[PDB]
Motif scaffolding. Structure first.
Motif, PDB file in Angstrom:
ATOM      1  N   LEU A  91      -1.539   9.898  12.867  1.00 13.14           N
ATOM      2  CA  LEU A  91      -1.363  11.319  12.591  1.00 13.14           C
ATOM      3  C   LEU A  91      -0.085  11.868  13.201  1.00 13.14           C
ATOM      4  N   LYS A  92       0.294  11.393  14.391  1.00 13.62           N
ATOM      5  CA  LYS A  92       1.501  11.916  15.024  1.00 13.62           C
ATOM      6  C   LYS A  92       2.742  11.602  14.190  1.00 13.62           C
ATOM      7  N   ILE A  93       2.808  10.399  13.606  1.00 10.73           N
ATOM      8  CA  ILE A  93       3.879  10.114  12.652  1.00 10.73           C
ATOM      9  C   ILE A  93       3.727  11.004  11.432  1.00 10.73           C
ATOM     10  N   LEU A  94       2.487  11.190  10.970  1.00 10.78           N
ATOM     11  CA  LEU A  94       2.283  11.936   9.732  1.00 10.78           C
ATOM     12  C   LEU A  94       2.788  13.366   9.874  1.00 10.78           C
ATOM     13  N   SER A  95       2.506  13.994  11.009  1.00 13.98           N
ATOM     14  CA  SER A  95       2.892  15.377  11.250  1.00 13.98           C
ATOM     15  C   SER A  95       4.401  15.582  11.238  1.00 13.98           C
ATOM     16  N   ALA A  96       5.199  14.518  11.123  1.00 13.98           N
ATOM     17  CA  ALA A  96       6.651  14.631  11.194  1.00 13.98           C
ATOM     18  C   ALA A  96       7.344  14.523   9.838  1.00 13.98           C
ATOM     19  N   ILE A  97       6.648  14.104   8.780  1.00  8.98           N
ATOM     20  CA  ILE A  97       7.269  13.999   7.463  1.00  8.98           C
ATOM     21  C   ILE A  97       7.155  15.375   6.816  1.00  8.98           C
ATOM     22  N   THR A  98       8.229  16.163   6.883  1.00 13.97           N
ATOM     23  CA  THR A  98       8.246  17.480   6.257  1.00 13.97           C
ATOM     24  C   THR A  98       8.471  17.402   4.751  1.00 13.97           C
ATOM     25  N   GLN A  99       8.817  16.205   4.324  1.00 11.98           N
ATOM     26  CA  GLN A  99       9.193  16.049   2.917  1.00 11.98           C
ATOM     27  C   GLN A  99       7.961  15.866   2.030  1.00 11.98           C
ATOM     28  N   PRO A 100       8.009  16.152   0.707  1.00  9.81           N
ATOM     29  CA  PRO A 100       6.881  15.839  -0.182  1.00  9.81           C
ATOM     30  C   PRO A 100       6.654  14.331  -0.287  1.00  9.81           C
ATOM     31  N   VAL A 101       5.392  13.934  -0.214  1.00 12.92           N
ATOM     32  CA  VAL A 101       5.045  12.529  -0.132  1.00 12.92           C
ATOM     33  C   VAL A 101       4.501  12.036  -1.472  1.00 12.92           C
ATOM     34  N   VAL A 102       4.587  10.705  -1.677  1.00 14.61           N
ATOM     35  CA  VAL A 102       3.944  10.028  -2.809  1.00 14.61           C
ATOM     36  C   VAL A 102       3.049   8.951  -2.210  1.00 14.61           C
ATOM     37  N   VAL A 103       1.779   9.272  -1.984  1.00 13.10           N
ATOM     38  CA  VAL A 103       0.829   8.254  -1.548  1.00 13.10           C
ATOM     39  C   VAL A 103       0.536   7.297  -2.701  1.00 13.10           C
ATOM     40  N   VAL A 104       0.546   6.006  -2.398  1.00 11.78           N
ATOM     41  CA  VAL A 104       0.271   4.929  -3.343  1.00 11.78           C
ATOM     42  C   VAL A 104      -0.674   4.004  -2.591  1.00 11.78           C
ATOM     43  N   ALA A 105      -1.968   4.112  -2.855  1.00 10.35           N
ATOM     44  CA  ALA A 105      -2.911   3.188  -2.238  1.00 10.35           C
ATOM     45  C   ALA A 105      -2.899   1.868  -3.009  1.00 10.35           C
ATOM     46  N   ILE A 106      -2.833   0.745  -2.280  1.00 14.40           N
ATOM     47  CA  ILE A 106      -2.980  -0.604  -2.832  1.00 14.40           C
ATOM     48  C   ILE A 106      -4.332  -1.116  -2.350  1.00 14.40           C
ATOM     49  N   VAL A 107      -5.387  -0.915  -3.111  1.00 15.80           N
ATOM     50  CA  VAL A 107      -6.729  -1.245  -2.649  1.00 15.80           C
ATOM     51  C   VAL A 107      -7.178  -2.535  -3.308  1.00 15.80           C
ATOM     52  N   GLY A 108      -7.767  -3.432  -2.527  1.00 16.15           N
ATOM     53  CA  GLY A 108      -8.184  -4.710  -3.058  1.00 16.15           C
ATOM     54  C   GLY A 108      -9.076  -5.437  -2.069  1.00 16.15           C
ATOM     55  N   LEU A 109      -9.969  -6.263  -2.599  1.00 13.60           N
ATOM     56  CA  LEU A 109     -10.710  -7.164  -1.719  1.00 13.60           C
ATOM     57  C   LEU A 109      -9.760  -8.114  -1.008  1.00 13.60           C
ATOM     58  N   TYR A 110     -10.188  -8.561   0.165  1.00 13.39           N
ATOM     59  CA  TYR A 110      -9.347  -9.370   1.029  1.00 13.39           C
ATOM     60  C   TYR A 110      -9.130 -10.743   0.372  1.00 13.39           C
ATOM     61  N   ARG A 111      -8.023 -11.397   0.735  1.00 17.08           N
ATOM     62  CA  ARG A 111      -7.597 -12.665   0.133  1.00 17.08           C
ATOM     63  C   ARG A 111      -7.222 -12.522  -1.345  1.00 17.08           C
ATOM     64  N   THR A 112      -6.834 -11.326  -1.778  1.00 21.99           N
ATOM     65  CA  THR A 112      -6.257 -11.163  -3.106  1.00 21.99           C
ATOM     66  C   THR A 112      -4.828 -10.654  -3.034  1.00 21.99           C
ATOM     67  N   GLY A 113      -4.268 -10.568  -1.835  1.00 20.39           N
ATOM     68  CA  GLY A 113      -2.855 -10.294  -1.679  1.00 20.39           C
ATOM     69  C   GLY A 113      -2.428  -8.916  -2.120  1.00 20.39           C
ATOM     70  N   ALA A 114      -3.241  -7.898  -1.856  1.00 18.36           N
ATOM     71  CA  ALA A 114      -2.734  -6.543  -2.003  1.00 18.36           C
ATOM     72  C   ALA A 114      -1.509  -6.342  -1.111  1.00 18.36           C
ATOM     73  N   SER A 115      -1.560  -6.880   0.106  1.00 21.44           N
ATOM     74  CA  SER A 115      -0.498  -6.598   1.052  1.00 21.44           C
ATOM     75  C   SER A 115       0.850  -7.097   0.547  1.00 21.44           C
ATOM     76  N   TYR A 116       0.861  -8.128  -0.303  1.00 17.48           N
ATOM     77  CA  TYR A 116       2.117  -8.524  -0.932  1.00 17.48           C
ATOM     78  C   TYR A 116       2.673  -7.383  -1.764  1.00 17.48           C
ATOM     79  N   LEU A 117       1.825  -6.838  -2.637  1.00 22.97           N
ATOM     80  CA  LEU A 117       2.186  -5.704  -3.477  1.00 22.97           C
ATOM     81  C   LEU A 117       2.765  -4.575  -2.653  1.00 22.97           C
ATOM     82  N   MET A 118       2.106  -4.250  -1.544  1.00 28.34           N
ATOM     83  CA  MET A 118       2.698  -3.290  -0.624  1.00 28.34           C
ATOM     84  C   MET A 118       4.093  -3.715  -0.218  1.00 28.34           C
ATOM     85  N   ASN A 119       4.203  -4.911   0.382  1.00 24.39           N
ATOM     86  CA  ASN A 119       5.463  -5.358   0.957  1.00 24.39           C
ATOM     87  C   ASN A 119       6.607  -5.177  -0.031  1.00 24.39           C
ATOM     88  N   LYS A 120       6.428  -5.626  -1.278  1.00 19.07           N
ATOM     89  CA  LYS A 120       7.551  -5.499  -2.209  1.00 19.07           C
ATOM     90  C   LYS A 120       7.749  -4.055  -2.627  1.00 19.07           C
TER      91      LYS A 120
END
Length: 577
Positions: free
Chosen positions: A26-55
């Protein structure tokens, strides 16, 4: 100019059976004064959502530096990156880490992860491997549980209404990434797209058996709850001999398919994702999403259900109080910068108060929204009325001191004369009254003397009515005729003095009432113009929603499911109330 943004971080963390916020997240969150684009990458584990995030976060090799920087990190994890195409915007990524792991107990926190990801996001990438079959759909029971976990609005005049019918208006776009997909996209010897594959897998089994409501429940949910639908396919990133060693590979050795599919998906997510907005066209930034997270998760841990409406109302009240303070601060700078400490007329001051009230209510209207019951405008009105009263107190004290001082200056000598005895001789009455009047005509002359002048003067002379009444009778040059005439003229004088006193007081009270009325006029004028826009926004949003509801009822009809299009008909009516 820095506003540097950190690396991946716990935002929510599932521990024991309890959801937990990261106060630094939250302390980081309270500092972004700019408009945000949240993009959730939701997936069961061992399906490599985190790759999708990384790229999507702009990592060159996404297979490296896993988001599992530590183990036992079950929960929602945040990444904050400047938006690469939307300048002056920051992309906010979210990941579900432990989604699927069986820990102690029924683990409902899992579907809570899901729900919360939806509530916070403005694009919702669900990630699954394989092909959309019976097993892929069973793992999406999280979506069949949303009518029991997200309430969109509180329920007064809402018993006859279906709350889920309202999800379409604030849910994110839905994007299904299918990874490790080796399926020729062929219908009857003709090619199809990835979206075409999705729409084909989103059709229904006729019947009403248990076996068939089960088949249809998830996919009615997907076509009825989300506003957009995209599908992206992904071929394995390498041949089999490299699958345990992706990190050690350079881009030249990945299947050119994966590489390409990944480029398509990233270009799309970057250009078509939208600033998360709230009912009423309210662009969301850090300080806002911060309380969104707080409200929702705090509802979940208190035994209650997250509710878009309670959350956005709480947000509104926070922002609105901020506006009250901004406005009273504008007011006070502008008062302080154009008021004469001893005001010449009462009208000058109420007129300045009124101008600066005008501008302060503008500052309010520009920084506020969803102010129900006009509670905050009334707070602002009370605050400005109290500042106006206080200024009036200071102003009367200013003028009273200006006159009370000058009163020693002009009338001082005369008191001296009454002790030295100047007026104890025959003819002393005429000596006192005539200079008394000279000085009085002198006190009047002083300019910018301010308002409580006639009151202060008169009080002093009520002190001194009797020094002359005493002289009138002890003089020896006057006849009885003359003393009688003078007693008669002093009655007349006092009479005209009290009359004019009352005429001033009514004038003052009438000015006060003009001002009260016109301040109230300025309030309604600005408030009704504001509401004329807010309704325009709500009209636009509700028209877009209606159009989406029609397209889906027509698709259900053409596919031959009238009952479903009939339920959705009840849903359209209730939008037009």
């Amino acid at each position: 100019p820095e506003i540097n943004l950190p690396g991946p971080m716990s935002l929510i963390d599932n521990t024991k059976g309890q959801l937990v916020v990261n106060p630094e997240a939250l302390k980081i969150l309270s500092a972004i004064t700019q408009p945000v684009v949240v993009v959730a990458i939701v997936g069961l584990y061992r399906t490599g959502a985190s790759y999708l995030m990384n790229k999507l976060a702009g990592k060159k090799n996404g297979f490296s530096l896993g988001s599992t920087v530590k183990s036992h990190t079950k929960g929602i994890w945040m990444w904050c990156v400047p938006h690469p195409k939307k300048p002056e915007h920051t992309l906010v990524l979210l990941d579900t880490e432990g989604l699927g792991d069986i820990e102690k107990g029924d683990n409902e926190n899992d579907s809570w992860i899901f729900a919360l990801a939806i509530l916070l996001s403005s694009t919702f990438v669900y990630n699954s491997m394989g092909t959309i079959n019976q097993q892929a759909m069973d793992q999406l029971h999280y979506v069949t549980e949303l009518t029991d976990r997200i309430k969109a609005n509180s329920s007064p005049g809402n018993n006859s209404v279906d709350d889920s019918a309202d999800f379409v208006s604030f849910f994110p776009a839905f994007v299904w990434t299918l990874r490790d997909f080796t399926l020729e996209l062929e219908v009857d010897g003709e090619p199809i797209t990835a979206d075409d594959y999705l729409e084909l897998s989103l059709k229904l089994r006729k019947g009403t058996d248990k076996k068939s409501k089960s088949f249809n429940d998830p996919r009615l949910c997907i076509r009825k709850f989300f506003p957009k639908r995209k599908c992206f396919v992904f071929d394995w990133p390498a041949p089999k001999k490299y699958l345990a060693h992706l990190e050690q590979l350079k881009e030249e050795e990945l299947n050119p398919d994966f590489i390409e599919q990944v480029a398509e998906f990233c270009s799309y997510i970057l250009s078509h994702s939208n600033v998360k907005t709230l009912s009423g066209g309210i662009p969301v930034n850090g300080p806002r999403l911060e309380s969104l997270v707080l409200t929702y998760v705090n509802a979940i841990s208190s035994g209650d259900l997250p509710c878009r409406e309670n959350a956005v109302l709480a947000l509104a009240q926070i922002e609105n109080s901020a506006a009250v303070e901004k406005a009273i601060a504008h007011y006070e700078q502008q008062m302080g910068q154009k008021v004469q400490l001893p005001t010449e007329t009462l009208q000058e001051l109420l007129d300045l108060h009124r101008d600066s009230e005008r501008e302060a209510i503008e500052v309010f209207m520009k920084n506020s929204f969803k102010d129900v019951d006009q509670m905050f405008q009334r707070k602002l009105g009370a605050q400005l009325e109290a500042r106006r009263d206080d200024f009036c107190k200071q102003n009367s004290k200013a003028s009273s001191d200006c006159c009370m001082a000058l009163l020693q200056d002009i009338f001082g000598p005369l008191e001296e004369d009454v002790k030295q005895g100047t007026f104890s001789k025959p003819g002393g009455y005429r000596l006192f009254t005539q200079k008394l009047q000279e000085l009085k005509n002198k006190y009047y002359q002083v300019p910018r003397k301010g308002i409580q002048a006639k009151e202060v003067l008169k009080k002093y002379l009520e002190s001194k009515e009797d020094v002359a009444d005493a002289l009138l009778q002890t003089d020896q040059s006057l006849s009885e005729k003359e003393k009688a005439i003078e007693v008669e003229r002093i009655k007349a004088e006092s009479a005209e003095a009290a009359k004019k006193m009352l005429e001033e007081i009514q004038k003052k009270n009438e000015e006060m009432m003009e001002q009260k009325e016109k301040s109230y006029q300025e309030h309604v004028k600005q408030l009704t113009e504001k509401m004329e826009r807010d309704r325009a926004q709500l009209m636009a949003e509700q028209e877009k929603t209606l159009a989406l509801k029609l397209q889906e009822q027509e698709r259900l009809l053409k596919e031959g499911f009238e009952n479903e299009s009939k339920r959705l008909q009840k849903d359209i009516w209730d939008i037009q109330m």
